[PDB]
Design a protein around this ligand. Structure first.
Ligand code: ADP
Ligand code: ADP
Ligand code: ADP
Ligand code: ADP
Ligand code: MG
Ligand code: MG
Ligand code: MG
Ligand code: MG
Lengths: 95, 48, 256, 259, 256, 258, 259
């Protein structure tokens, strides 16, 4: 379980959201649309990063469970490629 | 078709490049990521 | 009504049309056996129009041309790593088949395993996956079209007997090209008119007694294609409304 | 562990007793074999067995010995790892690997290649195998289900079947009751088919079946026990047209001309 | 025009030439029929010589020879398709032939998928490009050529009957030259003169009655070139302008 | 116009005639055929022909009509432009394109596949062709020639050989005189082989040949001897291994235990 | 170009003459063929020739025929340039190219493909580089060695091999002596095997063989020759157990239903 307090969270400006269509100015509407698109892309990227981190943590804990049971003295060797196999992303993302 | 391992044919390019936003997301910056998010939220007035 | 092209003036044609109109509302498998051409695909398309889901597309287009593996691949599409490694993921015939009705042209040529898979899809209602690691379910009507005797294959055991039984919810026999007698002249007039429209001729110059006698003596093995192709060839050869049609072009492969 | 009656009918015959016996076998996870001709609800029986266990919550799947591409079938049984063959985009999970901890139905065992027979017998309930291009073996759990319409003892005596495979399989044999001999359940099945058709045909009401149709059905050998019965019922319903009076004619052979 | 090179088999061949010339103003797709090794390229020569074709660039492709797994994709447009980044790659000869003549040679030995793609391209007009999302039909003259009886292939399922019947409206056949022995002497004299010019011979020594009788006796399955090839080989072997030739050897395998 | 002449060793009163005919044919640039068996050998005849023509200055590349990569045969013949394919970054010149203004000897055309036959088809008459990378086609003049050991008329009768291609090609056919047909320069060729081999073995001198060995050679059917005769000479020399005693016995066939 | 004495020495006058011919041919560079049974020490003969070759530093290639994948076997034979095909990045060195200037002893030459036969004939015919994607050929001063346990003339009579290839194959035939041709060397080989087995099993010493054992050796025909002898001796030693008394009987058939 990740630290929920440490987990970042962003909110969409509902008041700003409810003022895009009602705008009678083309420039203001275009700016609002661009800002909304950028915010949506950023939120999607943040959520994807959080999900990938959670999946990587789960895979490591699956690997670390063997290590934790074996203890520090008998810790099993681990490879970056071995963990990347446990996930679906490229090893660059894992690194 | 059939099962085989011939090594001569056409193909396509690798994964599409210039995913700068994804590259930053993959790296973990902890509070630095929080500071960057704060700067972006200062830039983006539609985010809270 | 889509102009009622290739109307079957025969009484048996009208009876078959009435039966189909009765069958068209019925959402059950249908099998068709008949002669070459004969607009069997056209009949299926008309029934699909006769079907309530007129909006729904009907891809059909299942002529028996691909190899045994190739035909299944067309049925199963393609996926990532498919066929021991495939570059493109193809939705395939099955994906386009979902929803509206589909017609299986010359369905007898397929392997019995493909027949079993198709029947199971019909029986189970769940689509079969080329990759096989993901479930698939599809709801659509189907139309079967072959030319030989399914009972003959069943006696030979070639086709899956259960598949043949389930598919033949209602067989659709067809009359021969030789069976129709008087509709030949009507179809000829229709072809001449449609060509004069297409070839921009002022009018069909009309036929002669020699043309009618040759048509009567013509075997016309192709119920649909042969007549239309011969008419088009003769029209192209003449290209004039001044002289009524008397010369006959029989063999496209004719020489000298 | 729910009732889920679903398509349960024909209890007048000893098929009810067969189901009762199979109920005991339902908790069992050992090899399972079913015996019966085509059109005998064998898939229905297998589905009932798989659903019977709460392990129905586990992955219950079916497979029939349809060759398709022999190499493709071999891969599906084995499981293509990523890059095993030229152009392999990613690892293809095996058909067996897809359903672990849940029932697996094996069909067309008579129509199985001898090489395919050996491939299957390689893990003859061994429980562990290796994927196509797999570095290390993997062990899974699944209760296999077998069924065929052929005399396996005969083919074994003929040598057509794999005797070792036969021994490895068929811890229990489920012989389908002869629906051709199940005359009492035939009337109830006809009633159920009529009810289903009325649900489907959406006509005013079922006029009935009179007695000439019943006599013809009794005369009919019904080579298609459960499948052809419903198909003939639908065909006769369609041919009858109006439902003013109970229908007495029987749509025996659609291959035969209607007149 | 280079027609005089062909010189025709006879007036009947000249009659077919006149018919083809009448057809030349039409840019619609055509079907070319002729014996293997019988001047079929020269048939395309007149079509290229058509004034409308004279303006545009003529592109002829050997369908049988042109074959590669990637070439299946290469024949497709991809004029904007960039899977490896090469959007600027064009359909190849398909894109190159735009604005000029197109010719498919040895189309019989081709993948059925390629045939359907061409048939699909032939049917209606180009649209919805693979990369460009909008293919455009180019008013480029096109025609097809084949040697064997593709009807037999379609009977065996090898020939796409849809394209075959579609192309069966502009079919022109080439009769065997073995029938036309009149121009045989003329073509032989032309070949002899050309060889004498090439080999720096004083002149063509001419043939004999024995030579003419042997030429008549020869089946000459190949006539456009194979007959000319034997003529050139005999001219080279003779190496003697003192007398006209009277001993011509056709079968090189025939020792002595 | 110069002639290195290579190593002829041919005076069979018919090999000379064949060489003279080739010399007449040497100026010709049309496609040629060679009926060359293994026991006929004479692959070097094609090389002599190539040297004979003024294209001796040009590339004398001979095409090994077998052992061709099925996957990359098209590029093998044609090559690829700078763009090439996904696999290739540079420009593949192409073997056929690599040949220009010179002789192209198709070696053992019989072994070529039907797909190979189709690939070769239209590559002769048309000449113009485009790289795998794709470009405007160009036809390059180059001498054409091919060879085989069997009766391609049978293969056409068998249908295995593409009859259209064979008929289009082979403006002339070269028939190799049989070793049995030769039957004249046996002793001279044997002497030449012994002279060549003595240096290789650093042998003292040629002991000479006895009448019994010559009679055996005459009686020897020797159906294949183009290089088989030389190989048998080498084997017999190794067996004798005695420059002091003249040679009289030769291992006819390395099959009998004896 | 070294002594490198090999204990695997054939104690036969026929074997002595074979060794003499092998030594005579050791300086020779022309390819030759080795004839002999399976397990008849042919690999040892090839190794002896390779060591005795003038090219002491010359490579010794295994050259297994049947090992070809046949999917891209010629590529392995012919090598490749860097990028010669799809997904290629390094110049593949061909098997001959890898063994250029060395020595290749065609292994399992009897079992090979017709396409393999054609490729080999092309290689033999004044071999050049002609690598996959290669723009220029080369030459290799590597000797060739041939060996098989089958009647090559019979195979050619069956059309199994190209007649030219066989003609292009051997300048001489190295027929290995038969085990039946060998005689009385069995005692020496048996003693050597006994010493080796005693050393390996940490046994005290060699108990020895009795007169019954000698008579059995006289009667026994070893179809596998040394390998047959090696296996029979190994079995007899394993069954012998204690070295208190010399051996008198040996297990003739390692696979015998008797007892
Ligand atoms: N007792 C039953 N109650 C209701 N339906 C049944 C019963 N037994 C069989 N059926 C139905 O009969 C149909 C035909 O059976 P069958 O063709 O044998 O299926 P399969 O061949 O796949 O085993 C099945 O779809 C099944 O649903
Ligand atoms: N009368 C002629 N004048 C000029 N060239 C000719 C004549 N007859 C034949 N040819 C040439 O001989 C060649 C033989 O081609 P051919 O094999 O007949 O083509 P196809 O294989 O398409 O029938 C042609 O390319 C043509 O250029
Ligand atoms: N005049 C000659 N002088 C020397 N050697 C010759 C002569 N004529 C033929 N040979 C030999 O005959 C052999 C035939 O080999 P080759 O031509 O490669 O066989 P094939 O052509 O059947 O593959 C050559 O190795 C060559 O050395
Ligand atoms: N002269 C010998 N003395 C002792 N052992 C030998 C002798 N020759 C061969 N052997 C043994 O017999 C075995 C024969 O194997 P191998 O060389 O593969 O024979 P082949 O190549 O004929 O199959 C070798 O492993 C070797 O140890
Ligand atoms: Mg079932
Ligand atoms: Mg041609
Ligand atoms: Mg040679
Ligand atoms: Mg060995």
């Amino acid at each position: 379980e990740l630290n929920a307090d440490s987990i970042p969270r962003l909110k969409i400006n509902q008041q700003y959201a409810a003022m895009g269509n009602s705008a009678r100015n083309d420039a203001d509407g275009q700016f609002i649309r661009s800002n909304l698109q950028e915010a949506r892309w950023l939120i999607k990227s943040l959520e994807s990063r959080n999900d990938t981190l959670l999946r990587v943590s789960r895979c490591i804990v699956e690997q670390q469970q063997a290590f934790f049971e074996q203890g520090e003295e008998y810790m099993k060797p681990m490879v970056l490629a071995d963990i990347a196999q446990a996930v679906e992303m490229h090893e660059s993302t894992i690194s | 078709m059939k099962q085989g391992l011939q090594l001569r044919l056409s193909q396509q390019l690798a994964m599409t490049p210039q995913l700068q936003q994804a590259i930053r997301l993959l790296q973990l910056s902890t509070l630095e990521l929080q500071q960057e998010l704060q700067q972006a939220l200062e830039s983006n007035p539609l985010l809270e | 009504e889509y102009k009622d092209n290739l109307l079957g003036e025969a009484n048996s044609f009208l009876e078959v049309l009435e039966q189909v109109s009765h069958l068209a509302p019925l959402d059950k498998p249908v099998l068709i056996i008949g002669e070459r051409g004969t607009g069997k695909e056209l009949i299926a398309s008309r029934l699909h129009y006769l079907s309530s889901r007129w909006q729904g597309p009907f891809i059909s287009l299942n002529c028996a041309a691909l190899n045994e593996n190739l035909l299944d691949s067309e049925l199963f599409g393609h996926e990532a790593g498919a066929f021991t490694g495939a570059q493109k993921r193809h939705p395939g015939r099955f994906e386009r088949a979902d929803g509206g009705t589909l017609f299986l042209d010359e369905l007898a040529t397929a392997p019995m395993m493909v027949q079993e898979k198709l029947l199971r899809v019909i029986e189970y209602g769940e689509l079969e996956r080329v990759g096989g690691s993901q479930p698939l379910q599809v709801n659509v009507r189907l139309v079967c079209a072959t030319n030989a005797d399914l009972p003959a294959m069943v006696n030979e055991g070639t086709f899956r007997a259960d598949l043949l039984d389930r598919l033949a919810f209602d067989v659709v026999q067809l009359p021969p090209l030789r069976e129709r007698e008087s509709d030949i002249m009507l179809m000829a007039e229709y072809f001449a008119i449609q060509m004069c429209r297409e070839i921009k001729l002022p009018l069909f110059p009309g036929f002669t007694e020699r043309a009618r006698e040759t048509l009567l003596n013509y075997r016309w093995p192709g119920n649909i294609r042969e007549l239309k192709n011969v008419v088009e060839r003769s029209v192209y050869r003449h290209g004039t409304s001044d002289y009524p049609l008397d010369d006959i072009i029989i063999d496209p492969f004719k020489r000298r």
